[PDB]
């Protein structure tokens, strides 16, 4: 997080470093000649002494932000689950008496009102996975007819698990006012045993959503789905991935996603264009499978990390790939806007700069998908068209923010900080616009949690080192927005507020300790704390310790700034975002 | 039917909506009068950009992906008489078209600088030799010794 | 999970529940690659617990790639053995060398591109090298572990030798290749029949002796249909008696192998009693059409499109004396009786 | 398998052994061992069966029998578990 | 103006400027021999395409007086070696073919500008090319 | 005057877009582009100096080969020779090469090996085939390549230089390939061109092919003739010839093939690309007539761009669609065609063509996927199309919906082309 890296680099290496035959930190004057106090003996080519009145640590600190974003706000906040296996309980006598309450708790008319809510509002989510939901009302009828039976077939229990995943998606995206009209809270409190004054907005809707997701997984376990691979497993997981299920159970969602890759690739259908020698039922089956494929590639990229090694997305949207530009733009528009995001977020952990031709190509596809989302139908008698508009517009605003962030970090082009501020205000103005009635639940999609995490973390990081006014007002606005996010995110929202508070206290630490110049590099406790957060969470993401604990009774045996670093890490620990 | 382009100095410029959709950044901003900040562009430069969009309301420009239709496109007579301005204010018009994502103004305003880089005298290419350094003084002496025989 | 599955994969669990075993193997690939350990050589800077742990993952990774190859098919799409480069304690790496050589051989089954003679000769030189390495393994008649170890190594190298000279016989019809096939089939017999005489009959329960005897008795039946020979006939009688004498712990798969050998024996009678015809370029015979349809039916059974249509919901699937002989044989000896 | 009147030539044999290279795969590799034809509408599904089955088969095996099994594995099956678990003396604990 | 696009695109730019060099030699020869009148004195000398005299005998007489009347009384004596003189008249026949092609292109360029005095009669120049080739 | 420093202080996107529209023209001593010299009545002719007599005696025999082309109007040359001292050292020019190489050779096109002034130095030619900038490879690596490759090792490699025979004499081809052999510069070049200004090949072509196996960085091969296209890159039926062919090991290496200026590529019955089994793009630059039914199109090819053509047939998809839904052509033109231009059709204008589309009420969502499978049976996994300047398509143009969206087909110069239907 520290080198010299000043403005107005020199073209050739300086005369002193060629006199000495060493490497040249090719600045003006140098990091290697400023280290020895040879400032005036290196400037004398032209103009001279130029004014380096900027803050020189900032380029190689933004190149550090490209790694800090990946290891904190992507992996350590959402995709890290610290588990000790000696303390975690393990029995199937728990879920057979827990999930039985949640399956007997949902009544019939309550479930049909959930399905009506999905049919009227959530059409942008299931139609990629399951298709039209009027086919699924018959499956809810068959579930309530087969409810009192004793011998259930596997084919029936797959539809049961699919509609319980749909019910989970309904409970997650339902507003509290519509939820209170359907469900009573008091038998649920009599079962769970908690405080009576704990209504749905206070955090019980998330509990009921997580337990309905656990009931969908319990009915998948009653299918014995590993012995019977079927596309309804993939559909149920694509419904469950529309919630905060992949962030509540980030290691269970990776194994289910690996089973969905194994289930999908079992069909051995790589081309989804219907051929001429096909059954007309087989053609519609391959069209539905092609929609499920790109929905699965989206949900497959959104869980990428070290705890998910088996990937599915093997196609590139710019410039050995298999499966792209053969498919019609109806729901690959959700993938083509994420495959355009994968091209940007692959350079986070990667230690190389993206070429500017790639960034210009991505900017051109941004303009094309802007016109393509402006070229959509506006069904004013349908509420799911506005939610599809919000999804496909919030994704292109997110990829626009990330594109101009990487322009700001890697190359520092024309007004790219102002473009970061502009698209951050566009993200705010898309989320604040949903604070009106009839669309308050649009802000519950997990992409707004991911995007607000990235944006408020970068603005809180940039406010530490660059004192500005537009950035400060933007940070006030995102702090208000993070305070006004929906409470169904819960623990991840509290951890995001904690991370923003930690970066603000780190800003207060930055304006206290004087920066230690060292010629070619700088030194500050803020830099060391930021270096150490990545090392801590990379240590938490190292499965060698769980490996040593698994292989038997093997036990793993392993200045002035140090006091400030240790007191800040003991006061504001980075391990408080893992739980 | 009207939007407001707030400049960096704080002036409000009420522009017609169809005319101001020449800017790709504003036409995408309208998916949310409707005001929007343009933080780096002065009032005079933004006024020039708005007058340029007022003339080219009905004009037809290349498809922003063309090989020769974009490079070999000549400037308009209004575009050449329009950009007989100060040099730094010309670059600030280019910066305004780069921020507002107006590709034809970033085309016609940027072929003028290309016509000024070429078409200049070899005497003041000889004069502006190492105004930015780009060469060691040993190499500068070797270059000036290499073509000393002419003059 | 990976260790318990590698213990279960030494039984007929991957053949009793083949779609469950492929899902467990996919979870084992997910669990193993979660550790992100590529190289298994001990580094000098590591904790000496961690180096022994990486050696443990090396010897687990080689066994996992062995089972990963042994469950390769259409119902197992996610692979691990493809990430190990081919060759073209120290007795655990020998098993993976022989299994990787078998992987180099049997990749030419499904593809149509015939192997070069350079490839088969390089596999032959490596086969002689690992044959010397297996013959150099010491063994104690008291220590039954070492006897079963040498039986596994020698049976695997005899299986790879038999498959190599079978590919010599098939792809090139090299002289003195049928004698090598008969010789290594007799070597496989003399390895299996030896276990009945030495009170070590549980050596013949390993899942490699069901696969190898399946391939051998199927090829000798297929070759006795078309190319008559006395040594091949005596070898087929020995294979039939040995298949009758395989242990009952294989269960239904042994009965299905006896059924397949009986079907290929009854198909020899149909090749005898029906004269081969020709149209000037191709040779029409009912035996050929029955052998076409035996692949067509099982490729239809391994087609997950109809299960996809049943899974999507309201989409429902709707569907001379030559042909008479073919349909009567397929109504009498159906190929769908090797299924369960 | 092959590539009107009658004949007795041997053109079918090089085109038929190449057909054996496909038949060996699609019968003896896949269709005999790796193909399990299933019907999901006919297959039962509950956790009211495999719980009591596992309870019986774990309560059936006793303590003295299990160490005799482990001694059999230590004495006779050393070529199998060593790639998976290494030493089985560690597993007595 | 309809034929201008496939007249520019029919040549490489290098070939187009080589041909323009060769017919500029031709038009300079026509002005220094008073075939076409000069427009003025000490100004931009320029001839229209509409009245540029092009014929078989004019092209061949240009070819004579410039290319194959290689007298050069100050530098005639550099044709003693057979290798150098072979290279020199191979250069002569290559420039002969290229100047005939350039003046064919000029005669094709004058027809779109409505020049009635531009007819090549190309079998004559092909006979000249075959003569020097022989 | 113009200020160099103020231009190099403003950021690199604006400098890119300046050096984008500055095509390759760094000098003010440029020839007139060849459209004004022909769309003019007058013919500009030459007709004394004191300093240029020193320049045309000493500087000019160094640049005799590449600049004897401009002997018409020698005012263009005596103006050129003051640029010839100082333009290659200019900060604007070197900044143009810096921002070109920083964008992987996109801005100014195709630096070129040559052999002038006894050095084997690089050269840059503009669109009028005039040199403007000549650098030796030590000087080109020193102050433009190393000046932007500060420490990142993915930008020290310079693999985008064309070789371009027909620029220069076959003796100079031999000498250039020999000096290029004695250095380690075959990985330096990026593509090769071909000339030839009855299967006979020239001497400079054989010299180029016999050292083409040693490239190991060669892509983007291109030819310019027709009687040479039919020999060295077309399949032409022959499949086993050791000598004079283009050495199949280097057929696998190339990315794309440009076909510069011809009459037909299928002069025989089939313009077959059965070999070159690893190419992605194929650009038809000024070929007069091509038939898409006469190109055999390898297993993995993606882009077929084609500019400045005079006649196109098409992939005759209309002949195969009308057999599928089983109607007449006159009933198809007036019954099934919808001509929808909702919002994304109107994005890229195409004000002269009329973009059309099949119905939804007359096709019941089966035999729409079959009507689309006809189109994908004809294209065979290509994506990029890019029709520039064209005229007179014989069959009507048929594009799929999956490829018409996201601007993956792109008709640019629309005057005589019309009525593209999208199915
Ligand atoms: Zn230095
Ligand atoms: Zn220095």
Chain A residues with CB-CB distance to C310 below 8 A: 155
What subunits make at least 3 CB pairs under 8 angstroms with D?
A: A, C
Contact A225, A259 (CB under 8 A): yes
Is residue F53 less than 8 Å (CB to CB) from chain B?
no
Q: Which of D23, D31, D84 lies at the smallest CB-CB distance from C291?
A: D23
Q: Which of C116, C114, C25, C38 is nearest to C66 (CA)?
A: C25
- Residue F301 and residue F381: Cα distance in Å, rounded? 7
CA atoms within 13 A on the CB side of A194: 13
Report how many domains make up chain E: 1
Is residue A142 less than 8 Å (CB to CB) from chain D?
no
- Residue A205 and residue A176: Cα distance in Å, rounded? 8
Distance (Å) from the C-alpha of residue F11 to the closest C-alpha of chain A? 5
Q: Domain of residue E15: give its range.
A: 1-134
Q: Which of A214, A316, A309, A310 is nearest to A261 (CA)?
A: A310
Contact C201, C161 (CB under 8 A): no
- DSSP summary character for residue A148: S
From the CB coordinates, do chains E and C have 3 or more pairs under 8 Å?
Answer: no
- Residue F351 and residue A28: Cα distance in Å, rounded? 54
- How many angstroms from the chain centroid is the CA of residue D21? 22
Gyration radius (Cα) of chain B, Å: 20
CA atoms within 13 A on the CB side of A68: 23
- Cα distances from E131 to residues E70, E124, E126, in angstroms, run 17, 10, 8
**Which among C217, C274, C278, C279 is the top mutation candidate for probing chain D, defined by the most D β-carbons within 10 Å of its own β-carbon?**
C278
**C-alpha F94 to ligand 2 mean position (Å):** 23
**Which among A376, A407, A426 is the top mutation candidate for probing chain B, defined by the most B β-carbons within 10 Å of its own β-carbon?**
A426
Q: Which of A33, A49, A66, A114 is nearest to A454 (CA)?
A: A66
E14 vs F129: CB contact, 8 Å cut-off?
yes
- Cα distances from A347 to residues A76, A143, A342, A406, in angstroms, run 18, 47, 9, 9
What phi and psi, each to the nearest 5 degrees, are found at residue A406?
A: -75, -30
Q: Which two tokens stand for residue A235?
A: 């559909």
The contacts of residue A413 (CB under 8 Å, 6+ apart) are A407, F11, F12, F13
- Cα distances from B49 to residues A416, B44, D46, F16, in angstroms, run 20, 9, 71, 21
Is residue B24 less than 8 Å (CB to CB) from chain A?
yes
- Residue A575 and residue A80: Cα distance in Å, rounded? 11
The contacts of residue A105 (CB under 8 Å, 6+ apart) are A187, A188, A191
**C-alpha A561 to ligand 1 mean position (Å):** 29
The full DSSP string for A380-419 is TT-SHHHHHHHHHHHHHHHHHHHHHHHHHHHT--TTHHHH
Q: Is the dihedral of CA C297, C301, C304, C309 positive or negative?
A: positive
The full DSSP string for F88-121 is TT-HHHHHHHHHHHTTTS-SS---EE---TTS--
Q: Which of F309, F329, F302, F320 is nearest to F377 (CA)?
A: F320
The Cα angle at residue F409 between residues F406 and F412, in degrees rounded to 5:
115
3-class secondary-structure state, position F133: strand
Task: Report every protein residue that has its C-beta within 5 angstroms of ion ligand 1.
Answer: A 14, 17, 24, 30
Q: Which two tokens stand for residue A171?
A: 């409970």
β-strand pairing of D5-6 with F311-312: unpaired
The full DSSP string for E9-51 is TTS-HHHHHHHHHHHHHHHHHHHHTTSS----SSS--EEEGGG
Q: Which two tokens stand for residue C192?
A: 């299996």
Distance (Å) from the C-alpha of residue B114 to the closest C-alpha of chain F? 5
Helix (H) or strand (E) holding F257: strand F256-259
Q: Which of A131, A155, A267 lies at the smallest CB-CB distance from C308?
A: A267
Q: Which two tokens stand for residue A90?
A: 């393990």
The contacts of residue F369 (CB under 8 Å, 6+ apart) are A273, A274, A283, A287
The contacts of residue C276 (CB under 8 Å, 6+ apart) are C283, C284, C285, D6, D7, D8, D12
The Cα angle at residue F141 between residues F139 and F144, in degrees rounded to 5:
85
Q: Which two tokens stand for residue C5?
A: 């599955």
Q: Which of B58, B6, B66 is nearest to B37 (CA)?
A: B6
3-class secondary-structure state, position B34: strand
Where in chain B are the domains?
1-151
Q: Which of C37, C53, C316 lies at the smallest CB-CB distance from A551?
A: C53
Neighbour-count burial of A531, counting CB atoms closer than 10 A to its CB (0-12 exposed, 13-18 middle, 19+ buried): middle
β-strand pairing of F303-306 with F281-284: parallel
Burial E1-10 (b: 16+ CB within 10 A, else e): eeeeeeebee
DSSP percent split of chain D into helix, strand, coil, nearest 5: 55, 5, 40
Q: Which of F13, F143, F402 lies at the smallest CB-CB distance from A326?
A: F402
Chain E residues with CB-CB distance to F286 below 8 A: 9
Helix (H) or strand (E) holding F305: strand F303-306
Neighbour-count burial of E134, counting CB atoms closer than 10 A to its CB (0-12 exposed, 13-18 middle, 19+ buried): exposed
**C-alpha A18 to ligand 1 mean position (Å):** 8
Q: Which of C3, C59, C279 lies at the smallest CB-CB distance from D4?
A: C279
Q: Which of F28, F82, F412 lies at the smallest CB-CB distance from B119?
A: F28
- DSSP summary character for residue A513: S
Q: Which two tokens stand for residue A518?
A: 């060292």
Superfamily of domain B1-151 in CATH is Potassium Channel Kv1.1; Chain A (3.30.710.10)
A151 vs D40: CB contact, 8 Å cut-off?
no
**Which among D14, D29, D34, D77 is the top mutation candidate for probing chain C, defined by the most C β-carbons within 10 Å of its own β-carbon?**
D34
C77 vs A262: CB contact, 8 Å cut-off?
yes
What phi and psi, each to the nearest 5 degrees, are found at residue F267?
A: -65, -40
Distance (Å) from the C-alpha of residue A492 to the closest C-alpha of chain F? 36
- Residue E120 and residue E97: Cα distance in Å, rounded? 15
3-class secondary-structure state, position A334: helix
F373 vs A273: CB contact, 8 Å cut-off?
yes
Q: Which of B87, B113, B129 lies at the smallest CB-CB distance from F18?
A: B113
- Residue C272 and residue C270: Cα distance in Å, rounded? 5
Residue B13, strand partner residues: B5
- Residue A206 and residue A492: Cα distance in Å, rounded? 12
**C-alpha A520 to ligand 2 mean position (Å):** 11
**Which among A93, A155, A233, A554 is the top mutation candidate for probing chain D, defined by the most D β-carbons within 10 Å of its own β-carbon?**
A155
What phi and psi, each to the nearest 5 degrees, are found at residue E3?
A: -95, 0
A157 vs D38: CB contact, 8 Å cut-off?
no
- Cα distances from B130 to residues A319, B133, B135, in angstroms, run 38, 5, 7
Q: Which of D2, D33, D76 lies at the smallest CB-CB distance from C18?
A: D33
Angle formed by the axes of helices C305-312 and A231-240, nearest 10°: 50
What subunits make at least 3 CB pairs under 8 angstroms with F?
A: A, B, E
Distance (Å) from the C-alpha of residue D85 to the closest C-alpha of chain C? 6
- DSSP summary character for residue F62: T
- Cα distances from E115 to residues A434, E21, E26, in angstroms, run 74, 21, 17
The contacts of residue D25 (CB under 8 Å, 6+ apart) are C109, C110
Is residue A92 less than 8 Å (CB to CB) from chain D?
yes
Distance (Å) from the C-alpha of residue F405 to the closest C-alpha of chain B? 15
Helix (H) or strand (E) holding F281: strand F281-284
Contact E7, E19 (CB under 8 A): no
* Conformational region of residue B36, where left means phi above 0, alpha means psi within -120 to 50, and beta covers everything else: beta
Contact C74, A268 (CB under 8 A): yes
- How many angstroms from the chain centroid is the CA of residue B81? 14
Is residue F346 less than 8 Å (CB to CB) from chain B?
no
Q: Which stretches of chain B are assigned E, i.e. beta strand?
A: 2-6, 12-16, 34-37
B116 vs F92: CB contact, 8 Å cut-off?
no
Helices (H), E67-134: 82-111, 122-133
Is residue D32 less than 8 Å (CB to CB) from chain A?
no
- CB contacts under 8 A, A 276-295 vs C, are 279, 281-282, 284-285, 288-289
Chain A residues with CB-CB distance to F13 below 8 A: 413-414
Q: Which of F43, F129, F261 lies at the smallest CB-CB distance from E46?
A: F43
What count of CB pairs under 8 Å joins A to F? 81
The two counts, helices (H) then strands (E), for chain B are 9, 3
- Residue A153 and residue A155: Cα distance in Å, rounded? 5
- Residue B121 and residue F11: Cα distance in Å, rounded? 26
Q: Which stretches of chain C are assigned E, i.e. beta strand?
A: 277-278
Is residue E45 less than 8 Å (CB to CB) from chain F?
yes
Is residue F48 less than 8 Å (CB to CB) from chain E?
no
The contacts of residue C298 (CB under 8 Å, 6+ apart) are C335, D26, D27, D30, D31, D35
- Residue F220 and residue F254: Cα distance in Å, rounded? 6
**C-alpha F156 to ligand 2 mean position (Å):** 22
Contact F211, F186 (CB under 8 A): yes
Chain B residues with CB-CB distance to A374 below 8 A: 31
Neighbour-count burial of F239, counting CB atoms closer than 10 A to its CB (0-12 exposed, 13-18 middle, 19+ buried): exposed
- CB contacts under 8 A, E 82-101 vs F, are none
- Cα distances from A74 to residues A420, A454, A579, F131, in angstroms, run 19, 8, 15, 52
- How many angstroms from the chain centroid is the CA of residue D23? 20
């Amino acid at each position: 997080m520290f080198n010299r890296t000043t403005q107005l680099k020199s073209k050739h290496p300086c005369s002193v470093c060629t006199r000495r035959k060493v490497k040249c930190d090719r600045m003006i004057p140098c990091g290697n000649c400023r280290k020895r106090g040879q400032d005036s003996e290196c400037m004398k080519s032209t103009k001279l002494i130029t004014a380096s009145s900027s803050k020189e640590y900032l380029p190689d600190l933004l190149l550090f932000w490209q790694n800090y974003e990946y290891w904190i706000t992507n992996i350590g906040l959402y995709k890290t689950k610290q588990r000790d296996l000696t303390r975690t309980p393990a029995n199937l006598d728990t879920d057979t008496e827990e999930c039985m309450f949640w399956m007997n708790y949902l009544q019939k008319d309550q479930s049909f009102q959930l399905m009506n809510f999905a049919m009227e509002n959530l059409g942008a989510l299931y139609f990629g996975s399951i298709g039209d939901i009027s086919e699924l009302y018959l499956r809810v009828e068959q579930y309530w007819d087969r409810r009192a039976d004793k011998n259930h077939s596997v084919d029936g229990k797959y539809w049961d698990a699919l509609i319980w995943s749909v019910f989970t998606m309904c409970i997650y995206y339902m507003p509290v006012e519509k939820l209170a009209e359907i469900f009573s809270v008091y038998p649920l409190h009599e079962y769970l045993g908690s405080n009576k004054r704990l209504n749905w907005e206070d955090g019980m809707q998330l509990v009921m959503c997580q337990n309905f997701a656990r009931c969908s997984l319990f009915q998948l376990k009653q299918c014995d789905f590993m012995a019977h691979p079927d596309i309804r497993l993939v559909q149920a997981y694509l419904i469950l991935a529309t919630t905060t299920f992949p962030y509540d159970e980030p290691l269970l969602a990776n194994s289910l996603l690996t089973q969905c890759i194994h289930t999908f690739k079992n069909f051995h259908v790589d081309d989804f264009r219907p051929l001429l020698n096909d059954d007309p039922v087989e053609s519609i089956a391959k069209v539905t499978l092609g929609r499920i494929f790109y929905r699965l590639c989206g949900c497959d990229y959104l869980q990428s990390g070290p705890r998910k090694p088996i990937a599915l997305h093997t196609e590139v949207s710019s410039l050995n790939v298999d499966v792209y530009r053969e498919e019609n733009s109806t729901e690959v528009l959700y993938w083509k806007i994420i495959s355009l995001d994968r091209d940007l977020d692959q350079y986070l952990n990667k230690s190389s700069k993206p070429p500017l031709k790639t960034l210009d190509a991505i900017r051109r596809e941004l303009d094309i998908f802007q016109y393509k989302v402006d070229s959509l139908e506006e069904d004013f008698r349908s509420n799911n068209s506005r939610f599809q508009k919000f999804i496909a517009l919030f994704q292109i605003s997110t990829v626009s923010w990330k594109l101009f962030k990487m322009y700001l970090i890697y190359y520092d082009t024309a007004d790219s900080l102002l473009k970061v501020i502009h698209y951050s205000k566009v993200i705010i103005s898309l989320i604040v616009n949903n604070f009106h009635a009839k669309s308050e639940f649009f802000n519950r999609h997990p992409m707004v949690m991911q995007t607000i995490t990235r944006v408020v973390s970068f603005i809180s990081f940039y406010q530490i080192f660059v004192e500005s006014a537009a950035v400060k007002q933007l940070l006030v606005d995102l702090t208000e927005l993070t305070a006004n996010l929906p409470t169904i995110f819960g623990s991840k929202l509290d951890k995001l507020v904690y991370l923003t508070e930690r970066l603000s206290k780190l800003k207060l630490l930055w304006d206290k300790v004087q920066l230690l110049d060292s010629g070619d590099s700088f030194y500050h406790p803020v830099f060391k704390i930021l270096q150490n957060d990545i090392k801590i969470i990379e240590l938490k993401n190292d499965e060698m310790f769980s490996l040593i604990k698994g292989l038997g009774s093997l036990v793993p045996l392993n200045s002035d700034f140090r006091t400030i670093v240790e007191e800040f890490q003991s006061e504001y620990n980075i391990s408080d975002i893992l739980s | 039917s009207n939007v407001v382009l707030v400049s960096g100095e704080g002036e409000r410029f009420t522009v017609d909506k169809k005319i101001a959709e020449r800017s790709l950044l504003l036409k995408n901003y309208l998916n949310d009068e409707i005001v929007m900040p343009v933080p780096n562009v002065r009032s005079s430069v933004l006024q020039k950009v708005i007058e340029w969009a007022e003339h080219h309301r009905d004009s037809n420009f290349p498809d922003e992906d063309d090989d020769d239709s974009r490079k070999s496109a000549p400037v308009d007579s209004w575009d050449r008489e329009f950009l007989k301005v100060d040099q730094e204010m010309l670059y600030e018009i280019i910066l305004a078209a780069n921020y507002l994502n107006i590709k034809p103004l970033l085309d016609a305003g940027c072929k003028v600088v290309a016509e000024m880089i070429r078409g200049r005298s070899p005497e003041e290419i000889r004069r502006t030799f190492n105004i930015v350094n780009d060469f060691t003084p040993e190499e500068e002496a070797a270059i000036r010794r290499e073509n000393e025989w002419a003059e | 999970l990976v260790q318990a599955y590698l213990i279960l994969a030494t039984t007929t669990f991957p053949y009793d529940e083949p779609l469950l075993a492929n899902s467990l193997l996919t979870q084992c690939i997910h669990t193993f690659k979660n550790f992100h350990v590529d190289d298994f050589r001990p580094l000098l800077n590591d904790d000496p617990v961690e180096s022994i742990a990486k050696v443990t993952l090396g010897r687990i990774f080689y066994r996992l790639c062995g089972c990963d190859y042994l469950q390769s098919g259409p119902r197992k799409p996610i692979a691990l053995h493809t990430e190990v480069s081919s060759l073209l304690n120290s007795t655990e790496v020998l098993y993976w060398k022989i299994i990787s050589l078998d992987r180099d051989l049997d990749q030419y089954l499904n593809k149509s591109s015939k192997p070069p003679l350079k490839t088969l000769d390089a596999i032959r030189r490596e086969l002689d090298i690992f044959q010397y390495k297996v013959d150099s393994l010491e063994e104690d008649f008291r220590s039954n572990n070492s006897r079963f170890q040498k039986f596994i190594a020698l049976f695997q190298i005899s299986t790879v030798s038999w498959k190599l000279f079978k590919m010599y016989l098939i792809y090139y019809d090299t002289a003195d290749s049928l004698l090598k096939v008969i010789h290594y089939s007799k070597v496989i017999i003399s390895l299996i029949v030896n276990n009945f005489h030495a009170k070590s009959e549980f050596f013949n329960r390993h899942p490699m002796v069901m696969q190898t005897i399946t391939r051998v008795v199927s090829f000798i039946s297929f070759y006795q249909i078309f190319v008559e020979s006395a040594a091949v006939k005596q070898l087929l009688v020995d294979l039939t008696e040995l298949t009758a004498n395989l242990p009952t712990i294989f269960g239904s798969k042994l009965d299905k192998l006896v059924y397949l050998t009986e079907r290929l024996s009854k198909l020899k009678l149909l090749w005898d009693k029906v004269q081969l015809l020709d149209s000037g370029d191709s040779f029409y015979h009912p035996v050929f059409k029955i052998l076409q349809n035996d692949i067509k039916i099982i490729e239809l059974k391994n087609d997950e499109m109809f299960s996809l249509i049943k899974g999507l919901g309201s989409l429902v699937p709707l569907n001379s004396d030559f042909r008479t002989i073919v349909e009567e044989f397929q109504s009498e000896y159906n190929i769908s009786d090797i299924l369960s | 398998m092959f590539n009107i009147t009658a004949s007795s030539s041997k053109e079918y044999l090089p085109d038929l052994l190449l057909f054996w290279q496909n038949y060996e795969y699609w019968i003896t590799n896949i269709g005999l061992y790796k193909t399990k034809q299933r019907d999901l509408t006919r297959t039962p599904a509950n956790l009211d069966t495999d719980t009591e089955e596992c309870m019986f088969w774990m309560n059936y095996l006793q303590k003295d029998q299990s160490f005799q099994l482990m001694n059999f594995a230590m004495e006779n099956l050393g070529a199998l578990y060593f790639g998976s678990i290494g030493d089985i003396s560690e597993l007595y604990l | 103006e309809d034929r201008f696009q496939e007249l520019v695109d029919s040549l490489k730019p290098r070939t187009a400027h080589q041909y323009k060099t060769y017919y500029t030699k031709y038009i300079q020869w026509c002005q220094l021999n008073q075939i076409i009148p000069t427009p003025e004195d000490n100004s931009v000398n320029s001839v229209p395409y509409k009245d540029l005299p092009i014929s078989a005998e004019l092209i061949h007489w240009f070819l004579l007086d410039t290319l194959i009347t290689d007298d050069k009384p100050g530098e005639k004596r550099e044709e003693t070696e057979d290798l150098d003189e072979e290279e020199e008249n191979s250069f002569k026949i290559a420039t002969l073919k290229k100047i005939i092609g350039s003046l064919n292109f000029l005669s094709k360029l004058c027809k779109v500008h409505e020049n009635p005095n531009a007819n090549i009669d190309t079998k004559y120049l092909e006979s000249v090319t075959k003569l020097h080739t022989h | 005057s113009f200020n160099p420093v103020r231009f190099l202080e403003l950021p690199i996107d604006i400098r890119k877009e300046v050096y984008f529209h500055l095509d390759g023209n760094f000098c003010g001593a440029h020839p007139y582009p060849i459209d004004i010299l022909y769309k003019s009545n007058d013919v500009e002719l030459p007709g004394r100096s004191k300093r240029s007599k020193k320049l045309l005696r000493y500087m000019y025999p160094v640049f005799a080969t590449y600049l004897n082309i401009f002997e018409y109007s020698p005012q263009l040359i005596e103006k050129w020779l003051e640029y010839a001292f100082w333009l290659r050292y200019d900060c604007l020019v070197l900044d143009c090469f810096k921002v070109n190489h920083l964008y992987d050779g996109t801005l100014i096109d195709a630096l070129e090996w040559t052999y002038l002034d006894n050095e084997l130095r690089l050269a840059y030619f503009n669109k009028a085939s005039m040199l403007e900038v000549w650098y030796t490879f030590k000087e080109y690596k020193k102050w433009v390549i190393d000046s932007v490759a500060f420490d990142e090792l993915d930008l020290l490699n310079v693999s985008n230089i064309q070789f371009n025979i027909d620029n220069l004499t076959p003796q100079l081809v031999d000498k250039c390939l020999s000096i290029l052999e004695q250095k380690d510069l075959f990985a330096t070049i990026g593509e090769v061109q071909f000339g030839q200004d009855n299967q006979l090949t020239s001497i400079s072509v054989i010299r180029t092919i016999r050292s083409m196996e040693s490239m190991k960085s060669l892509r983007k091969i291109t030819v310019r003739g027709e009687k040479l296209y039919e020999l060295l890159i077309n399949f032409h039926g022959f499949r086993d010839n050791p000598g004079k062919t283009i050495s199949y090991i280097v057929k696998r290496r190339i990315n794309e093939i440009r076909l510069s200026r011809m009459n037909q590529i299928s002069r025989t019955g089939l313009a077959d690309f059965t070999r070159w089994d690893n190419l992605q793009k194929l650009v038809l630059s000024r070929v007069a007539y091509i038939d898409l039914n006469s190109i055999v199109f390898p297993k993995n090819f993606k882009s077929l761009t084609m500019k400045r053509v005079s006649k196109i047939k098409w992939w005759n998809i209309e002949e195969n669609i009308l057999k599928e839904l089983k109607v007449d052509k006159r009933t198809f033109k007036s019954l099934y065609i919808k001509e929808d231009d909702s919002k994304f059709t109107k994005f890229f204008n195409l004000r002269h063509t009329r973009i059309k589309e099949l119905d939804k009420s007359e096709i019941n969502q089966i035999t729409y996927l079959r009507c689309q499978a006809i189109v994908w049976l004809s294209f065979r996994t290509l994506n990029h199309i890019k029709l520039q300047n064209v005229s007179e398509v014989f069959n009507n143009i048929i594009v799929p919906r999956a490829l018409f969206d996201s601007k993956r087909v792109e008709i640019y110069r629309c005057e005589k082309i019309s009525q593209v239907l999208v199915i």
